[PDB]
Amino acid sequence: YSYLLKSYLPIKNILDKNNVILQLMTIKNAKFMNKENKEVDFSTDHLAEEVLDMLLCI
Amino acid sequence: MDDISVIKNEDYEGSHRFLAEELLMPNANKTDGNRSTMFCSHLAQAVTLQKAEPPLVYTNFENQVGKYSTAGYRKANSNYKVIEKIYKNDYNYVLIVQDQETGEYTLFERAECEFLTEHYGFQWDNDKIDSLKKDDTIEKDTVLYKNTCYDENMNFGYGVNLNAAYFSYKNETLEDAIVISESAAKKLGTFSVNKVKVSVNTNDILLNLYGDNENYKGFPDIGEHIKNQIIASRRRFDYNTALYELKNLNEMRDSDTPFFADGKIVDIEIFSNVPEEELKVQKYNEQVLYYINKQKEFSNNVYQKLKKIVEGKDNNVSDKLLHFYNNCKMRIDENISYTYQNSKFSGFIMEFTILEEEPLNKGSKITGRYGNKGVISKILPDDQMPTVAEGRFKGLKADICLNPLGVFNRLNPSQLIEQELNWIAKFIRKDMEEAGSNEEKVSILLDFLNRVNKEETELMEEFINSLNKTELEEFLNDIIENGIPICQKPFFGNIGLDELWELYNHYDHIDYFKCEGISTPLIIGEIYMVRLKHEPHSKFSARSTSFMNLRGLPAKSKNFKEHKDLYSKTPVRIGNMEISNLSLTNEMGSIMDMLNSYSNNETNRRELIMQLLTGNPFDTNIDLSDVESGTSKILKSLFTCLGLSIDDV
Amino acid sequence: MEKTYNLNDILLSNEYEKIKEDIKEEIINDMASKKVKYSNTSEFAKNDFLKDEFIDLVVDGETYEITYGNLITLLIVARPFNHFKVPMTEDLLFDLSD
Amino acid sequence: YLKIGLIKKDYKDLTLGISNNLLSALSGDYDGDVLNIIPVFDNKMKEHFSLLSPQNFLVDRNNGRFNGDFDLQKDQILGIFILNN
């Protein structure tokens, strides 16, 4: 997250302080049901790791 | 009719009161009225030259024209004392002065360039005002800042002096075209100034086009030059697209709006309606904050330093100084609000003054003083041009080459006359150089002048007799190398055919120059050349896809005026006469397909763009739909409102 | 200058282009070497250029006397006969001076 | 109906290089006046507008003869006259 913030550093002064879009995406956890009407549960830390790696893989 | 009978030749003897513009044209007696009208228009179409030179063949009315035209020089009409100097930029400062006689306080501002309109303007020679410091004295007649058209002794010259020859260069001079050497092309260079405004709101942010990772600059500094032909670029910021678009703020994206200009910055002025604190927060607009604080500090300085002068009851302040002080005090005052086009603007607005040196290019028009218009066909190496290899004048090359076909038909003999006189002046100067006695030199010079213009001979005799021996030696040497001034007044005092006959029969040694590889012996001689405003950049346009009108038909946009686009992108109109001429090809289907795909029909346009974008680049075959055109729809609606409907039989 | 040239043979040969270029180069170099003299009177000066010299041309078995510049211009104007490999016809000839 | 044969290598140079013999047909001169260019993309359109090519205008439609508008201009005429006469 720090390595990612180094790239987003110019906009941190004003835009990120009002709302961190990266952290806002990471924290959003909504109900998920498959087409087969089966729900899934997963830890937020794994989703956060993959979100950081996705934003870095750009 | 007999009305013209009122014109008495005796009344206008030794008089130039009937001449106006033509006063700058030597031998106006010999030129026809059409070429004279062309010269009068050219004087307006002329552009300022960086290397302006006084005319070798002159009328002596030119310096008067320069003096009475007030746009090039500034004169402090009264005696002044420099009260103070305050710096806005390194290129722009302000001088507060006081009339020693009247006691009034006045103001003088300096800048590197002055802008007239569009991309036209000129650079300044601010050395005299830059030499002035606090408590210095300005005399009653002093050139504080001057244009490049005026030299050191206030002699005025609207063009350059170029060695010309009448020559047919590989049919590159057909009709009327000019081929010019690169060395002569350097002398025919001009200035280009542009005042470009970029407006930034809270939605859009600037891009780090200039600088590194530690330093964020969206626009060049004052001393810096433009890179990649982009003054700045702006991105609209929205929280939904902010995660991916805002990253890599250093590089350009398709969504960005760029602004195009080229040259060197010389003055930037930023008007901000945003609270300064929010700008202090924002890193991307830090440079804007720095320049805002610079302007505010300059205004604070002028307030602090001129409050005593302006608010002193027993003092007189010029209206210009008062308005300047009031504007700066408004800018430093709280609750100040700026309006553009009678509307409060969001964010800020930045105005850039950009100055560059543009040289001579193909398609640029340069002309003489006798209506001899010409378009530069080729700029060639100075070696690959007529060179003379016989006699004393070996190694001399022609700076420009002109078409010799219809010189007589154009009814402008003064061109040939100026060329002949400068050509014989070359021989006179060489004869002077060969002599080792100064008295012999002045004798030769006075002989030639007395043969041309007697009054100039008397004046040069007086001038030489008044000079010191060292000054006379400098005069003689610079005349030998640079050239000799010859005076051919427009109407009275010109050199006619018989005078040239006498000159040619006296100087028996003078003959045509034999040039390398050229069978015809030709004459080379200096004539005056001025640069016209029309240029290849003036009317260039190139539109593929641009903004569509409200009616779905292509139309022009103001983007080129706002410097949002590099070329005009202005659509051409196919006239009714053009349709008639195109109707020669009896394939009306192809013409209708052209007009529909390019303009009338949206579906055909989209199909054409898709076929050209994806498919075979080298073999492009398009299939177009038969959907009704939008023009047909508008016609149908209009006629329906009329009550009539066109229907095929 | 070779005094005699066979028109149809130059037109049919595949060396037509290089022959045209050689004649052109000779003419332009000779003109560059020499200088024109003007008598400015009724009499005309003795200016000898390669274009002014006469040559004999063999066309369809007949001899026509034309200038060298006339020859090179005629070769330029006779491209159809090299393209189609058809012999130059004497009726397709005129005064190259006019 | 003309063909592009070269792309100019200089960004500063912005001038269509047109042949001299084309001036008389256009009824124009080198006075700097701008000419309009409309590129033709479709191959069928190329074969249809090829009737406006210089070859089709080589034959003067009034007399069925060679069009002097595509012949030598006055400077080329001077050169050829010096060569042949």
PDB file of all heavy atoms in Angstrom, chain A residues 4 7-8 10-11 13-15 18-19 21-22 25 55-56 58, chain B residues 216 237 239 242-244 246-249 278 281-284:
ATOM      1  N   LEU A   4       2.194   1.724  -3.452  1.00  0.00           N
ATOM      2  CA  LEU A   4       1.123   2.241  -4.298  1.00  0.00           C
ATOM      3  C   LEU A   4       0.871   3.721  -4.030  1.00  0.00           C
ATOM      4  O   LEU A   4       0.649   4.498  -4.965  1.00  0.00           O
ATOM      5  CB  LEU A   4      -0.153   1.431  -4.074  1.00  0.00           C
ATOM      6  CG  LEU A   4      -1.161   1.382  -5.221  1.00  0.00           C
ATOM      7  CD1 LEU A   4      -0.458   1.391  -6.570  1.00  0.00           C
ATOM      8  CD2 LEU A   4      -2.041   0.154  -5.078  1.00  0.00           C
ATOM      9  N   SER A   7       3.018   6.240  -5.862  1.00  0.00           N
ATOM     10  CA  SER A   7       2.602   6.604  -7.213  1.00  0.00           C
ATOM     11  C   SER A   7       1.439   7.592  -7.191  1.00  0.00           C
ATOM     12  O   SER A   7       1.362   8.485  -8.044  1.00  0.00           O
ATOM     13  CB  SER A   7       2.221   5.353  -8.004  1.00  0.00           C
ATOM     14  OG  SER A   7       3.291   4.424  -8.047  1.00  0.00           O
ATOM     15  N   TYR A   8       0.526   7.446  -6.230  1.00  0.00           N
ATOM     16  CA  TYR A   8      -0.604   8.350  -6.064  1.00  0.00           C
ATOM     17  C   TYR A   8      -0.279   9.533  -5.161  1.00  0.00           C
ATOM     18  O   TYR A   8      -1.198  10.195  -4.668  1.00  0.00           O
ATOM     19  CB  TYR A   8      -1.812   7.592  -5.507  1.00  0.00           C
ATOM     20  CG  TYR A   8      -2.444   6.622  -6.479  1.00  0.00           C
ATOM     21  CD1 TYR A   8      -1.936   5.341  -6.641  1.00  0.00           C
ATOM     22  CD2 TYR A   8      -3.556   6.985  -7.225  1.00  0.00           C
ATOM     23  CE1 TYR A   8      -2.513   4.450  -7.525  1.00  0.00           C
ATOM     24  CE2 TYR A   8      -4.141   6.102  -8.111  1.00  0.00           C
ATOM     25  CZ  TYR A   8      -3.617   4.836  -8.257  1.00  0.00           C
ATOM     26  OH  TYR A   8      -4.197   3.953  -9.139  1.00  0.00           O
ATOM     27  N   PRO A  10       0.974  12.695  -5.634  1.00  0.00           N
ATOM     28  CA  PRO A  10       0.526  14.069  -5.931  1.00  0.00           C
ATOM     29  C   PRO A  10      -0.914  14.349  -5.534  1.00  0.00           C
ATOM     30  O   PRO A  10      -1.209  15.434  -5.016  1.00  0.00           O
ATOM     31  CB  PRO A  10       0.727  14.170  -7.448  1.00  0.00           C
ATOM     32  CG  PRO A  10       1.860  13.259  -7.715  1.00  0.00           C
ATOM     33  CD  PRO A  10       1.617  12.083  -6.813  1.00  0.00           C
ATOM     34  N   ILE A  11      -1.827  13.397  -5.758  1.00  0.00           N
ATOM     35  CA  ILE A  11      -3.239  13.615  -5.445  1.00  0.00           C
ATOM     36  C   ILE A  11      -3.572  13.368  -3.984  1.00  0.00           C
ATOM     37  O   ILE A  11      -4.720  13.588  -3.577  1.00  0.00           O
ATOM     38  CB  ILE A  11      -4.139  12.719  -6.322  1.00  0.00           C
ATOM     39  CG1 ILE A  11      -4.144  11.285  -5.791  1.00  0.00           C
ATOM     40  CG2 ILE A  11      -3.679  12.760  -7.773  1.00  0.00           C
ATOM     41  CD1 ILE A  11      -5.124  10.376  -6.498  1.00  0.00           C
ATOM     42  N   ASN A  13      -2.690  15.016  -1.364  1.00  0.00           N
ATOM     43  CA  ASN A  13      -2.808  16.211  -0.535  1.00  0.00           C
ATOM     44  C   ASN A  13      -4.261  16.625  -0.334  1.00  0.00           C
ATOM     45  O   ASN A  13      -4.645  17.054   0.761  1.00  0.00           O
ATOM     46  CB  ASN A  13      -2.011  17.357  -1.157  1.00  0.00           C
ATOM     47  CG  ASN A  13      -0.532  17.048  -1.262  1.00  0.00           C
ATOM     48  OD1 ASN A  13      -0.126  15.886  -1.253  1.00  0.00           O
ATOM     49  ND2 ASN A  13       0.284  18.091  -1.365  1.00  0.00           N
ATOM     50  N   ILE A  14      -5.088  16.503  -1.373  1.00  0.00           N
ATOM     51  CA  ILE A  14      -6.461  16.992  -1.351  1.00  0.00           C
ATOM     52  C   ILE A  14      -7.465  15.867  -1.582  1.00  0.00           C
ATOM     53  O   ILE A  14      -8.411  15.695  -0.807  1.00  0.00           O
ATOM     54  CB  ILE A  14      -6.669  18.131  -2.376  1.00  0.00           C
ATOM     55  CG1 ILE A  14      -8.161  18.367  -2.626  1.00  0.00           C
ATOM     56  CG2 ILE A  14      -5.924  17.838  -3.671  1.00  0.00           C
ATOM     57  CD1 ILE A  14      -8.450  19.543  -3.533  1.00  0.00           C
ATOM     58  N   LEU A  15      -7.271  15.083  -2.643  1.00  0.00           N
ATOM     59  CA  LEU A  15      -8.297  14.132  -3.053  1.00  0.00           C
ATOM     60  C   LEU A  15      -8.335  12.904  -2.149  1.00  0.00           C
ATOM     61  O   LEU A  15      -9.419  12.442  -1.775  1.00  0.00           O
ATOM     62  CB  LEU A  15      -8.076  13.727  -4.510  1.00  0.00           C
ATOM     63  CG  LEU A  15      -7.706  14.895  -5.425  1.00  0.00           C
ATOM     64  CD1 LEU A  15      -7.368  14.411  -6.821  1.00  0.00           C
ATOM     65  CD2 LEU A  15      -8.839  15.907  -5.472  1.00  0.00           C
ATOM     66  N   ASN A  18      -9.917  13.525   1.377  1.00  0.00           N
ATOM     67  CA  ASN A  18     -11.375  13.527   1.371  1.00  0.00           C
ATOM     68  C   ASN A  18     -11.914  12.105   1.289  1.00  0.00           C
ATOM     69  O   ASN A  18     -12.890  11.760   1.968  1.00  0.00           O
ATOM     70  CB  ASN A  18     -11.895  14.361   0.199  1.00  0.00           C
ATOM     71  CG  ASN A  18     -11.453  15.811   0.263  1.00  0.00           C
ATOM     72  OD1 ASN A  18     -10.836  16.245   1.233  1.00  0.00           O
ATOM     73  ND2 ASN A  18     -11.778  16.571  -0.777  1.00  0.00           N
ATOM     74  N   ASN A  19     -11.284  11.266   0.468  1.00  0.00           N
ATOM     75  CA  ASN A  19     -11.668   9.864   0.354  1.00  0.00           C
ATOM     76  C   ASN A  19     -10.582   9.037  -0.329  1.00  0.00           C
ATOM     77  O   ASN A  19     -10.173   9.356  -1.449  1.00  0.00           O
ATOM     78  CB  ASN A  19     -12.985   9.732  -0.415  1.00  0.00           C
ATOM     79  CG  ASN A  19     -13.427   8.289  -0.558  1.00  0.00           C
ATOM     80  OD1 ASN A  19     -13.536   7.764  -1.665  1.00  0.00           O
ATOM     81  ND2 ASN A  19     -13.686   7.639   0.568  1.00  0.00           N
ATOM     82  N   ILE A  21      -9.794   6.265  -2.456  1.00  0.00           N
ATOM     83  CA  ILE A  21     -10.562   5.401  -3.349  1.00  0.00           C
ATOM     84  C   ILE A  21     -10.078   3.963  -3.249  1.00  0.00           C
ATOM     85  O   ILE A  21     -10.873   3.019  -3.321  1.00  0.00           O
ATOM     86  CB  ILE A  21     -10.492   5.924  -4.796  1.00  0.00           C
ATOM     87  CG1 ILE A  21     -10.441   7.453  -4.817  1.00  0.00           C
ATOM     88  CG2 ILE A  21     -11.676   5.409  -5.607  1.00  0.00           C
ATOM     89  CD1 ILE A  21     -11.751   8.115  -4.438  1.00  0.00           C
ATOM     90  N   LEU A  22      -8.768   3.772  -3.072  1.00  0.00           N
ATOM     91  CA  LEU A  22      -8.223   2.426  -2.928  1.00  0.00           C
ATOM     92  C   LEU A  22      -8.768   1.747  -1.675  1.00  0.00           C
ATOM     93  O   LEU A  22      -9.293   0.626  -1.734  1.00  0.00           O
ATOM     94  CB  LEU A  22      -6.696   2.495  -2.894  1.00  0.00           C
ATOM     95  CG  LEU A  22      -5.912   1.191  -2.774  1.00  0.00           C
ATOM     96  CD1 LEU A  22      -6.151   0.315  -3.993  1.00  0.00           C
ATOM     97  CD2 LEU A  22      -4.430   1.484  -2.600  1.00  0.00           C
ATOM     98  N   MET A  25     -12.527   1.043  -1.984  1.00  0.00           N
ATOM     99  CA  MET A  25     -12.797  -0.189  -2.718  1.00  0.00           C
ATOM    100  C   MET A  25     -12.486  -1.411  -1.866  1.00  0.00           C
ATOM    101  O   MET A  25     -13.249  -2.386  -1.867  1.00  0.00           O
ATOM    102  CB  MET A  25     -11.979  -0.224  -4.006  1.00  0.00           C
ATOM    103  CG  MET A  25     -12.042  -1.554  -4.741  1.00  0.00           C
ATOM    104  SD  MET A  25     -10.953  -1.592  -6.172  1.00  0.00           S
ATOM    105  CE  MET A  25      -9.553  -0.682  -5.527  1.00  0.00           C
ATOM    106  N   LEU A  55      -4.024  -3.299  -8.634  1.00  0.00           N
ATOM    107  CA  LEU A  55      -3.704  -1.904  -8.915  1.00  0.00           C
ATOM    108  C   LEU A  55      -2.232  -1.726  -9.267  1.00  0.00           C
ATOM    109  O   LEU A  55      -1.879  -0.794  -9.998  1.00  0.00           O
ATOM    110  CB  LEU A  55      -4.080  -1.022  -7.726  1.00  0.00           C
ATOM    111  CG  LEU A  55      -5.429  -0.301  -7.806  1.00  0.00           C
ATOM    112  CD1 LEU A  55      -5.496   0.567  -9.053  1.00  0.00           C
ATOM    113  CD2 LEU A  55      -6.578  -1.294  -7.779  1.00  0.00           C
ATOM    114  N   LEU A  56      -1.363  -2.609  -8.768  1.00  0.00           N
ATOM    115  CA  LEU A  56       0.044  -2.547  -9.142  1.00  0.00           C
ATOM    116  C   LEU A  56       0.309  -3.166 -10.510  1.00  0.00           C
ATOM    117  O   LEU A  56       1.221  -2.723 -11.217  1.00  0.00           O
ATOM    118  CB  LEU A  56       0.905  -3.239  -8.083  1.00  0.00           C
ATOM    119  CG  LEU A  56       1.171  -2.449  -6.801  1.00  0.00           C
ATOM    120  CD1 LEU A  56       1.770  -3.348  -5.731  1.00  0.00           C
ATOM    121  CD2 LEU A  56       2.090  -1.273  -7.088  1.00  0.00           C
ATOM    122  N   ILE A  58      -1.301  -2.861 -13.150  1.00  0.00           N
ATOM    123  CA  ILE A  58      -1.675  -1.963 -14.236  1.00  0.00           C
ATOM    124  C   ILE A  58      -0.420  -1.432 -14.916  1.00  0.00           C
ATOM    125  O   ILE A  58      -0.323  -1.391 -16.143  1.00  0.00           O
ATOM    126  CB  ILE A  58      -2.557  -0.806 -13.727  1.00  0.00           C
ATOM    127  CG1 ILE A  58      -3.895  -1.340 -13.211  1.00  0.00           C
ATOM    128  CG2 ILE A  58      -2.778   0.225 -14.824  1.00  0.00           C
ATOM    129  CD1 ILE A  58      -4.874  -0.253 -12.821  1.00  0.00           C
TER     130      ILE A  58
ATOM    131  N   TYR B 216       6.999  19.255  -9.608  1.00  0.00           N
ATOM    132  CA  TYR B 216       5.775  19.177 -10.398  1.00  0.00           C
ATOM    133  C   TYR B 216       5.523  20.539 -11.035  1.00  0.00           C
ATOM    134  O   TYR B 216       5.189  21.504 -10.338  1.00  0.00           O
ATOM    135  CB  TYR B 216       4.594  18.749  -9.527  1.00  0.00           C
ATOM    136  CG  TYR B 216       3.362  18.309 -10.294  1.00  0.00           C
ATOM    137  CD1 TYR B 216       2.953  16.981 -10.287  1.00  0.00           C
ATOM    138  CD2 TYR B 216       2.599  19.222 -11.010  1.00  0.00           C
ATOM    139  CE1 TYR B 216       1.825  16.576 -10.978  1.00  0.00           C
ATOM    140  CE2 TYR B 216       1.473  18.826 -11.707  1.00  0.00           C
ATOM    141  CZ  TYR B 216       1.091  17.503 -11.687  1.00  0.00           C
ATOM    142  OH  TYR B 216      -0.032  17.109 -12.379  1.00  0.00           O
ATOM    143  N   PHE B 237     -11.448  15.703 -13.334  1.00  0.00           N
ATOM    144  CA  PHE B 237     -11.346  14.802 -12.193  1.00  0.00           C
ATOM    145  C   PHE B 237     -12.738  14.441 -11.692  1.00  0.00           C
ATOM    146  O   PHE B 237     -13.542  15.327 -11.379  1.00  0.00           O
ATOM    147  CB  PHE B 237     -10.520  15.437 -11.073  1.00  0.00           C
ATOM    148  CG  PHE B 237     -10.917  14.986  -9.694  1.00  0.00           C
ATOM    149  CD1 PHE B 237     -10.637  13.700  -9.256  1.00  0.00           C
ATOM    150  CD2 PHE B 237     -11.570  15.854  -8.832  1.00  0.00           C
ATOM    151  CE1 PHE B 237     -11.004  13.289  -7.987  1.00  0.00           C
ATOM    152  CE2 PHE B 237     -11.937  15.449  -7.563  1.00  0.00           C
ATOM    153  CZ  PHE B 237     -11.654  14.167  -7.139  1.00  0.00           C
ATOM    154  N   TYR B 239     -14.517  11.261  -9.032  1.00  0.00           N
ATOM    155  CA  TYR B 239     -14.121  10.222  -8.087  1.00  0.00           C
ATOM    156  C   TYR B 239     -14.313   8.821  -8.655  1.00  0.00           C
ATOM    157  O   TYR B 239     -13.625   7.884  -8.233  1.00  0.00           O
ATOM    158  CB  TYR B 239     -14.902  10.377  -6.783  1.00  0.00           C
ATOM    159  CG  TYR B 239     -14.389  11.489  -5.895  1.00  0.00           C
ATOM    160  CD1 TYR B 239     -15.027  12.722  -5.857  1.00  0.00           C
ATOM    161  CD2 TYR B 239     -13.268  11.307  -5.097  1.00  0.00           C
ATOM    162  CE1 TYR B 239     -14.563  13.742  -5.047  1.00  0.00           C
ATOM    163  CE2 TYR B 239     -12.796  12.321  -4.285  1.00  0.00           C
ATOM    164  CZ  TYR B 239     -13.447  13.536  -4.264  1.00  0.00           C
ATOM    165  OH  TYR B 239     -12.979  14.547  -3.457  1.00  0.00           O
ATOM    166  N   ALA B 242     -11.242   8.363 -10.904  1.00  0.00           N
ATOM    167  CA  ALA B 242     -10.012   8.894 -10.322  1.00  0.00           C
ATOM    168  C   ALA B 242      -8.986   7.810 -10.019  1.00  0.00           C
ATOM    169  O   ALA B 242      -7.782   8.089 -10.030  1.00  0.00           O
ATOM    170  CB  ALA B 242     -10.333   9.673  -9.047  1.00  0.00           C
ATOM    171  N   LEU B 243      -9.429   6.580  -9.755  1.00  0.00           N
ATOM    172  CA  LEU B 243      -8.500   5.551  -9.298  1.00  0.00           C
ATOM    173  C   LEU B 243      -7.492   5.175 -10.377  1.00  0.00           C
ATOM    174  O   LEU B 243      -6.313   4.954 -10.080  1.00  0.00           O
ATOM    175  CB  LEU B 243      -9.268   4.315  -8.837  1.00  0.00           C
ATOM    176  CG  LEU B 243      -8.419   3.214  -8.201  1.00  0.00           C
ATOM    177  CD1 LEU B 243      -7.614   3.754  -7.029  1.00  0.00           C
ATOM    178  CD2 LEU B 243      -9.301   2.060  -7.763  1.00  0.00           C
ATOM    179  N   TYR B 244      -7.931   5.093 -11.632  1.00  0.00           N
ATOM    180  CA  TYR B 244      -7.050   4.675 -12.715  1.00  0.00           C
ATOM    181  C   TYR B 244      -6.544   5.837 -13.559  1.00  0.00           C
ATOM    182  O   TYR B 244      -5.398   5.807 -14.018  1.00  0.00           O
ATOM    183  CB  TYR B 244      -7.757   3.661 -13.623  1.00  0.00           C
ATOM    184  CG  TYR B 244      -9.222   3.943 -13.878  1.00  0.00           C
ATOM    185  CD1 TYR B 244      -9.622   4.675 -14.987  1.00  0.00           C
ATOM    186  CD2 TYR B 244     -10.204   3.475 -13.014  1.00  0.00           C
ATOM    187  CE1 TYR B 244     -10.957   4.936 -15.229  1.00  0.00           C
ATOM    188  CE2 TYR B 244     -11.541   3.731 -13.247  1.00  0.00           C
ATOM    189  CZ  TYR B 244     -11.912   4.462 -14.356  1.00  0.00           C
ATOM    190  OH  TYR B 244     -13.243   4.720 -14.592  1.00  0.00           O
ATOM    191  N   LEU B 246      -6.130   9.141 -12.675  1.00  0.00           N
ATOM    192  CA  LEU B 246      -5.243  10.080 -11.993  1.00  0.00           C
ATOM    193  C   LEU B 246      -3.840   9.511 -11.817  1.00  0.00           C
ATOM    194  O   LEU B 246      -2.869  10.275 -11.767  1.00  0.00           O
ATOM    195  CB  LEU B 246      -5.829  10.474 -10.640  1.00  0.00           C
ATOM    196  CG  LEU B 246      -7.146  11.251 -10.689  1.00  0.00           C
ATOM    197  CD1 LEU B 246      -7.428  11.906  -9.351  1.00  0.00           C
ATOM    198  CD2 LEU B 246      -7.120  12.290 -11.799  1.00  0.00           C
ATOM    199  N   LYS B 247      -3.710   8.191 -11.711  1.00  0.00           N
ATOM    200  CA  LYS B 247      -2.387   7.584 -11.684  1.00  0.00           C
ATOM    201  C   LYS B 247      -1.680   7.836 -13.010  1.00  0.00           C
ATOM    202  O   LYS B 247      -2.311   7.918 -14.068  1.00  0.00           O
ATOM    203  CB  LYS B 247      -2.488   6.083 -11.408  1.00  0.00           C
ATOM    204  CG  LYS B 247      -1.152   5.417 -11.122  1.00  0.00           C
ATOM    205  CD  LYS B 247      -1.295   3.913 -10.960  1.00  0.00           C
ATOM    206  CE  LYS B 247       0.027   3.274 -10.564  1.00  0.00           C
ATOM    207  NZ  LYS B 247      -0.097   1.802 -10.381  1.00  0.00           N
ATOM    208  N   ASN B 248      -0.354   7.971 -12.942  1.00  0.00           N
ATOM    209  CA  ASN B 248       0.460   8.377 -14.089  1.00  0.00           C
ATOM    210  C   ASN B 248       0.028   9.751 -14.597  1.00  0.00           C
ATOM    211  O   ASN B 248      -0.268   9.942 -15.779  1.00  0.00           O
ATOM    212  CB  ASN B 248       0.417   7.333 -15.209  1.00  0.00           C
ATOM    213  CG  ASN B 248       1.626   7.405 -16.120  1.00  0.00           C
ATOM    214  OD1 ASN B 248       2.575   8.143 -15.855  1.00  0.00           O
ATOM    215  ND2 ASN B 248       1.597   6.639 -17.204  1.00  0.00           N
ATOM    216  N   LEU B 249      -0.011  10.720 -13.679  1.00  0.00           N
ATOM    217  CA  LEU B 249      -0.330  12.098 -14.030  1.00  0.00           C
ATOM    218  C   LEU B 249       0.743  12.747 -14.895  1.00  0.00           C
ATOM    219  O   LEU B 249       0.525  13.856 -15.394  1.00  0.00           O
ATOM    220  CB  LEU B 249      -0.535  12.923 -12.757  1.00  0.00           C
ATOM    221  CG  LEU B 249      -1.697  13.919 -12.723  1.00  0.00           C
ATOM    222  CD1 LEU B 249      -2.957  13.307 -13.315  1.00  0.00           C
ATOM    223  CD2 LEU B 249      -1.952  14.397 -11.302  1.00  0.00           C
ATOM    224  N   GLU B 278      -6.717  26.507  -0.400  1.00  0.00           N
ATOM    225  CA  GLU B 278      -6.938  25.276  -1.152  1.00  0.00           C
ATOM    226  C   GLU B 278      -5.831  25.050  -2.174  1.00  0.00           C
ATOM    227  O   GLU B 278      -5.407  23.910  -2.397  1.00  0.00           O
ATOM    228  CB  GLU B 278      -8.309  25.314  -1.828  1.00  0.00           C
ATOM    229  CG  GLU B 278      -8.886  23.944  -2.146  1.00  0.00           C
ATOM    230  CD  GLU B 278     -10.300  24.019  -2.694  1.00  0.00           C
ATOM    231  OE1 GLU B 278     -10.732  25.125  -3.083  1.00  0.00           O
ATOM    232  OE2 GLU B 278     -10.982  22.973  -2.729  1.00  0.00           O
ATOM    233  N   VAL B 281      -2.923  23.609  -0.455  1.00  0.00           N
ATOM    234  CA  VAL B 281      -3.069  22.166  -0.272  1.00  0.00           C
ATOM    235  C   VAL B 281      -2.659  21.422  -1.540  1.00  0.00           C
ATOM    236  O   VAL B 281      -1.875  20.467  -1.493  1.00  0.00           O
ATOM    237  CB  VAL B 281      -4.507  21.815   0.146  1.00  0.00           C
ATOM    238  CG1 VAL B 281      -4.651  20.312   0.327  1.00  0.00           C
ATOM    239  CG2 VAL B 281      -4.879  22.546   1.424  1.00  0.00           C
ATOM    240  N   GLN B 282      -3.169  21.856  -2.691  1.00  0.00           N
ATOM    241  CA  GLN B 282      -2.980  21.119  -3.937  1.00  0.00           C
ATOM    242  C   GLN B 282      -1.524  21.179  -4.395  1.00  0.00           C
ATOM    243  O   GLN B 282      -0.955  22.264  -4.552  1.00  0.00           O
ATOM    244  CB  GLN B 282      -3.904  21.682  -5.014  1.00  0.00           C
ATOM    245  CG  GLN B 282      -5.367  21.728  -4.597  1.00  0.00           C
ATOM    246  CD  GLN B 282      -6.192  22.677  -5.446  1.00  0.00           C
ATOM    247  OE1 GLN B 282      -7.189  23.231  -4.984  1.00  0.00           O
ATOM    248  NE2 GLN B 282      -5.774  22.876  -6.689  1.00  0.00           N
ATOM    249  N   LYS B 283      -0.929  20.003  -4.619  1.00  0.00           N
ATOM    250  CA  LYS B 283       0.442  19.919  -5.115  1.00  0.00           C
ATOM    251  C   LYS B 283       0.531  20.181  -6.613  1.00  0.00           C
ATOM    252  O   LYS B 283       1.519  20.762  -7.078  1.00  0.00           O
ATOM    253  CB  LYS B 283       1.033  18.545  -4.788  1.00  0.00           C
ATOM    254  CG  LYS B 283       2.450  18.320  -5.307  1.00  0.00           C
ATOM    255  CD  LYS B 283       3.458  19.245  -4.645  1.00  0.00           C
ATOM    256  CE  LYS B 283       4.871  18.956  -5.132  1.00  0.00           C
ATOM    257  NZ  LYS B 283       5.877  19.861  -4.509  1.00  0.00           N
ATOM    258  N   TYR B 284      -0.482  19.771  -7.378  1.00  0.00           N
ATOM    259  CA  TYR B 284      -0.419  19.915  -8.829  1.00  0.00           C
ATOM    260  C   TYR B 284      -0.448  21.375  -9.262  1.00  0.00           C
ATOM    261  O   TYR B 284       0.085  21.712 -10.325  1.00  0.00           O
ATOM    262  CB  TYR B 284      -1.562  19.139  -9.489  1.00  0.00           C
ATOM    263  CG  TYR B 284      -2.873  19.175  -8.728  1.00  0.00           C
ATOM    264  CD1 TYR B 284      -3.807  20.177  -8.957  1.00  0.00           C
ATOM    265  CD2 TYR B 284      -3.181  18.193  -7.793  1.00  0.00           C
ATOM    266  CE1 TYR B 284      -5.008  20.206  -8.268  1.00  0.00           C
ATOM    267  CE2 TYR B 284      -4.377  18.215  -7.099  1.00  0.00           C
ATOM    268  CZ  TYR B 284      -5.287  19.222  -7.339  1.00  0.00           C
ATOM    269  OH  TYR B 284      -6.479  19.246  -6.650  1.00  0.00           O
TER     270      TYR B 284
END
